[PDB]
Amino acid sequence: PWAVKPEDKAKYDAIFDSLSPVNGFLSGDKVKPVLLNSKLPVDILGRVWELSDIDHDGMLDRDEFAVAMFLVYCALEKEPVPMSLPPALVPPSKR
Amino acid sequence: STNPFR
Ligand SMILES: [Ca+2]
Numbered sequence: 001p002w003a004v005k006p007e008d009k010a011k012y013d014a015i016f017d018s019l020s021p022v023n024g025f026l027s028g029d030k031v032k033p034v035l036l037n038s039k040l041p042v043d044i045l046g047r048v049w050e051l052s053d054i055d056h057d058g059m060l061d062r063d064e065f066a067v068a069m070f071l072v073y074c075a076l077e078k079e080p081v082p083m084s085l086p087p088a089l090v091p092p093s094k095r
Numbered sequence: 096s097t098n099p100f101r
Contacts, residue, residue, distance in 0.1 A: 028099030035100065046100030058097055 003089045009066040016065035025059035031068065038072040044081055048072050051085045054094060063091035 004012070019030030026034075028049060035045030045068075052060050052068025060068055067089045071081045 028097075032099045042100035046098050049098055049100055053097070056097065058099075 001088070002091060003086065004066050004070055008070055009063070012066035012069035013062050015069060016060065016062050021062065022059070025057065025061045026065050027059045031060045031065060034065075035068065035072050038076055040072060040075050044072065044075045047083050048075070048081050050083065051081065051089065054085075054090065063093055066091070 002009075015034055016026055019026050019034060031049060031052075032045065035048060036042070038045070040048075048068045048071035049060065051071060052064050052066075054064045054067070055061070067085075075081055
């Protein structure tokens with residue numbers, strides 16, 4: 001299944017749409033601050049964004065911004081983040 | 096270039 005659920009991606013879509021989405025995408029200029037707010041270093045956001053950037057277009061779409069929300073909230077109370085976009089984090093749009 | 100964090 002998808003590492004992220006509908007309730008976990010539902011809150012991600014609110015933070016993703018709280019920065020002003022463009023055609024379904026957020027520029028690091030909207031996410032960077034979203035990740036810099038997790039009290040984590042740019043090493044987690046520099047790596048959480050990448051694994052979050054499913055298209056590598058310099059933005060986090062509703063599905064990409066989702067993978068970067070649990071990757072940031074887990075580095076605060078759960079564990080760090082690896083740099084290998086796991087296949088369990090890919091949304092259905094990448095099927 | 097990319098990833099505006101690092
Ligand atoms: Ca992307």
